[PDB]
Amino acid sequence: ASSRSELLLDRFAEKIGVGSISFNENRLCSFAIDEIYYISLSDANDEYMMIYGVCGKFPTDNPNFALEILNANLWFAENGGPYLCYESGAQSLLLALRFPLDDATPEKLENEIEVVVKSMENLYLVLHN
Amino acid sequence: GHLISSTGALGSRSLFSPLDIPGLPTNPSR
Numbered sequence: 001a002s003s004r005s006e007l008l009l010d011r012f013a014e015k016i017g018v019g020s021i022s023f024n025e026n027r028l029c030s031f032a033i034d035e036i037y038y039i040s041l042s043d044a045n046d047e048y049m050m051i052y053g054v055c056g057k058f059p060t061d062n063p064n065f066a067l068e069i070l071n072a073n074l075w076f077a078e079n080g081g082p083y084l085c086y087e088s089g090a091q092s093l094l095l096a097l098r099f100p101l102d103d104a105t106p107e108k109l110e111n112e113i114e115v116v117v118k119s120m121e122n123l124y125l126v127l128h129n
Numbered sequence: 130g131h132l133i134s135s136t137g138a139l140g141s142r143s144l145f146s147p148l149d150i151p152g153l154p155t156n157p158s159r
Binding site: 031 | 131132133134135137138139141142143144145146147149150151152153154155156157
């Protein structure tokens with residue numbers, strides 16, 4: 001008797017053929033695509049899921065580049081990509097994509113998940129050094 | 130290690146599920 005988030009998941013895992021997945025005690029579903037690109041699907045809200053791409057711990061040794069990331073965010077804003085965000089509980093960088101649930105489809109979830117992957121992939125290219 | 134055989138935009142080899150990247154289970158609302 002599940003809300004639409006929990007269907008999309010099941011329907012999505014059916015679409016890519018990886019079996020079955022679920023949401024955890026903390027209302028999210030973390031899977032790592034190719035053991036490098038970490039992604040956690042959250043259903044933050046009745047209206048939307050968030051899509052988190054985790055990019056590791058965040059450097060703090062001459063971290064003048066926090067302003068470089070903030071500068072990178074210009075690119076993702078023009079391109080429609082995820083928001084570059086910093087998170088304090090794991091000191092980890094994050095790509096954030098909101099994903100709304102009306103007119104949501106397994107192919108649309110699949111599409112946006114890999115958007116976070118190509119963002120996490122291309123990130124070092126979008127930066128100056 | 131799950132292999133994807135989908136038409137969708139995941140033309141990529143495998144998915145690993147996590148029970149140097151944190152894979153956090155929560156971020157601070159407040």
